[PDB]
Design a protein around this ligand. Structure first.
Ligand SMILES: [Cl-]
Ligand SMILES: [Cl-]
Ligand SMILES: [Cl-]
Lengths: 121, 121
């Protein structure tokens, strides 16, 4: 894909305006950032390192951030009223590491032993 | 929707068998888990708290895990050779909080100042 085509996956003209303004404002606020197009999506990078990625869907703009950033901001993201998701991609065409999946479950079960809410806050 | 309807979203018979076996194997290993259907996807829960979510796409099974779990397991996920993603959903119909996006970028920039890889490892 190209960057021209990605912009065309944004559902409506007002949605495109929102993304264009966001990009422009963030570039103005962080002049060192490079807006690259990599693995078929726009990403801000800084001195050859990932900062943020972007992908549209029918109902939302998905903003991609690093694991440590997500961890640090959970309280502030929840307060702002936005849902978040952390996923591992298991390709259909590759083996499924069930030991890994098992270990993720076991660790989470242990950490949430005394949880009083459905989601980690 | 429903769990039946969700299973129909899995793209091939072999992919369906994979998902069926995975659920069965994890339920056998963790007999306390309930497989619930919430917010249009299957989720393992334990004593009413979230443990793991699932969703198919054309190319992969997406396994949803909590932020603390993703953070803990990055080295093991990378070693296993799977990609991972952490996203915030900014709905098109709701205001976009640019201060939050600014703060996320600023924090990530500071954290990556001395980074020697593209992605957090
Ligand atoms: Cl909750
Ligand atoms: Cl571990
Ligand atoms: Cl890397």
């Amino acid at each position: 894909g190209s960057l021209a085509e990605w912009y065309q996956r944004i559902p409506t003209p007002d949605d495109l305006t929102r993304v264009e303004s966001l990009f422009a404002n963030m570039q103005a606020q962080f002049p060192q950032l490079k807006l690259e197009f990599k693995w078929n999506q726009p990403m801000f990078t800084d001195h050859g390192t990932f900062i943020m990625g972007f992908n549209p869907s029918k109902k939302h703009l998905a903003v991609a951030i690093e694991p440590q950033t997500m961890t640090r901001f959970i309280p502030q993201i929840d307060k702002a009223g936005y849902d978040h998701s952390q996923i591992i991609r298991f390709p259909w065409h590759k083996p499924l590491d069930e030991q890994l999946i098992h270990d993720l479950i076991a660790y989470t079960i242990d950490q949430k032993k005394d949880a009083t809410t459905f989601w980690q806050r």
